[PDB]
Write a protein that binds this DNA or RNA. Structure first.
Ligand SMILES: [K+]
Ligand SMILES: [K+]
Ligand SMILES: [K+]
Ligand SMILES: [K+]
Ligand SMILES: [K+]
Ligand SMILES: [K+]
Length: 523
RNA sequence: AAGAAUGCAUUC
């Protein structure tokens, strides 16, 4: 049936003159049909062979063949009007009348208005499906945080304890709904920032033209990223939401964050293993990081990078010198006589002068991810040696500073990756520095501690293959039989700790770090 | 391990 609808749709969208009402009516009729169909398909699940259960494919086809093509149709209309404005500007320039150029804001606003009405319809549709999926069936595998983000309450409704496969299908449908909501909002924000806003006034047009985007327009994407984050909270093994967050950061020229999220996409447990890696490789092959490095080293610049952004640029250029030498290597230098050693020294100094746990966690993901992607033994060994020089600097900082989350992450990276542990324990400075760091801590723990709930880093790295999909420095057995799921997303709101949560988490992290670090040093 | 060059690292 979806094929018939997509045929009729493509016939409609191919007309020279678009009937907005006809399209919206047709979408509303198709949505009503699909809704009654999927409700009935879940209802009859236990009556037909499971492999005849079609809802996931039907939903995927509705998005890819019906709803997204309509989005792309509207985007193409916006682009047509934008190019008309560009043609008018070029004509006025070549005719010697540059001040006579005027943006026409009408017919950008009309197209966008029809587009917005369509977006409102599908936003309501996917939210309606998400609410149905989430509240019709009791599912202990849905965190109460997910429910509270949407103000959903689950009634005394259908209990499908009989079938865990059924509940897995239902949460996958909810995940698809959230993904579609993030995707439609991301497309809407892109269209607003690249076509509508520039066509509002000459000021907007010329600022869009001169500054490529210098996109600080992350505010336009906050809602879409929220939906992607909910996707990840629901099923962190699936790679698409991570990739879409990386796409958003790439479009706002936050290239390092893009690389980070593309790597997280690549390393999720059930990743398709292509989208993130291809997007990251396309970034690395380009000139943004080398140009950024030149601008930083020359000092004077309109760029005005923050210290964290400077560290990020340094890190990518240093990793690229080894991993992508055809772009980041000319003799001892990365670009334009800028030596690898100088940049390495500068970044390592900033580890201590500008320590930041989130910044360092992202650095570690990026450098050990690039290690994981490197096939050549010489390249891989050089990258590991660089990564462990970085880690040695981090441990030196930890002799006098605090970074328990970073330390947990480092130790678990070592624990879940035997070749990395072997390299680490063969470096005298790694052993010496880790010993000095651990001697700062006091702990009566001798075995893996237990705890009330997952912490921030546990939630953040769920189903990341860099740590073999979970931290293993706690005995979390009591948290994993899921007739509840709140501890796994770290929701301690149900636990009676008040502000002492911070003290509790610090003590527990310290215990886990002491026990695991002694394990590592004993090998 | 040396030896050489560039700013402990990188390069042959
Ligand atoms: K699934
Ligand atoms: K986030
Ligand atoms: K992209
Ligand atoms: K993509
Ligand atoms: K950055
Ligand atoms: K926490």
């Amino acid at each position: 049936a979806i094929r018939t609808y997509s045929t009729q749709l493509e016939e409609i969208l191919s007309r020279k003159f678009s009937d907005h009402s006809l399209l919206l009516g047709f979408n509303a009729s198709v949505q009503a049909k699909i809704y009654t169909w999927i409700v009935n398909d879940l209802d009859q699940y236990s009556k037909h062979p499971e492999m005849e259960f079609d809802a996931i494919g039907v939903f995927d086809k509705l998005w890819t063949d019906f709803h997204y093509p309509i989005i792309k149709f509207f985007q193409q209309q916006h682009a047509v009007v934008f190019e008309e404005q560009n043609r008018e500007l070029k004509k006025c320039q070549k005719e010697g009348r540059p001040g006579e150029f005027k943006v026409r804001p009408v017919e950008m606003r009309k197209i966008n208005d029809n587009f917005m009405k369509y977006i409102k319809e599908i936003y309501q549709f996917y939210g309606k499906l998400l609410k149905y999926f989430t509240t019709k069936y009791k599912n202990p595998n849905i965190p109460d945080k997910f429910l509270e983000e949407f103000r959903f309450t689950v009634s005394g409704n259908a209990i499908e304890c009989q079938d865990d496969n059924f509940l897995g299908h239902v949460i996958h449908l909810s995940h698809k709904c959230c993904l579609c909501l993030g995707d439609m909002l991301r497309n809407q924000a892109f269209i607003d920032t690249n076509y509508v806003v520039p066509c509002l006034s000459n000021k907007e047009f010329f600022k869009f033209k001169s500054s490529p985007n210098k996109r600080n327009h992350m505010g336009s994407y906050v809602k879409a990223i929220q939906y992607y984050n909910l996707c990840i909270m629901l099923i962190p093994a699936l790679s698409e939401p991570y990739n879409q967050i990386g796409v958003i950061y790439n479009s706002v020229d936050d290239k390092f964050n893009a690389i980070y999220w593309f790597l997280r996409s690549h390393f999720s447990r059930l990743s398709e293993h292509q989208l993130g890696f291809a997007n990251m490789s396309a970034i690395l092959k380009k000139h943004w990081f080398t140009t950024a490095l030149v601008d930083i080293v020359n000092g004077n610049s309109e760029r005005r990078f923050s210290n964290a952004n400077v560290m990020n640029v340094f890190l990518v250029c240093l990793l690229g010198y080894i991993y992508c030498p055809e772009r980041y290597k000319n003799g001892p230098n990365i670009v334009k006589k800028i030596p690898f050693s100088k940049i390495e020294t500068d970044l390592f100094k900033m580890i201590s002068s500008d320590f930041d746990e989130q910044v360092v966690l992202k650095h570690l993901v990026v450098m050990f991810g690039i290690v994981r992607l490197t096939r050549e033994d010489e390249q891989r060994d050089k990258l590991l040696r660089f990564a462990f020089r970085y880690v040695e600097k981090v441990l030196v900082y930890l002799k006098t500073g605090d970074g328990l989350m970073v330390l947990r992450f480092i130790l678990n990276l070592l624990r879940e990756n035997a070749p990395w542990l072997q390299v680490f324990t063969s470096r005298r400075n790694c052993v010496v520095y880790l010993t000095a760091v651990l001697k700062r801590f006091a702990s009566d723990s001798t075995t893996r501690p237990t705890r009330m709930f997952f912490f921030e880093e546990d939630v953040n790295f769920r189903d990341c293959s860099l740590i073999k999909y979970q931290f293993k420095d706690f005995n979390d057995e009591a948290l994993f039989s899921p007739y509840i799921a709140n501890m796994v997303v770290g929701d301690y709101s149900k636990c009676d700790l008040q502000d002492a949560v911070d003290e509790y988490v610090e003590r527990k992290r310290t215990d886990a770090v002491v026990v695991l670090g002694k394990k590592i040093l004993s090998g």
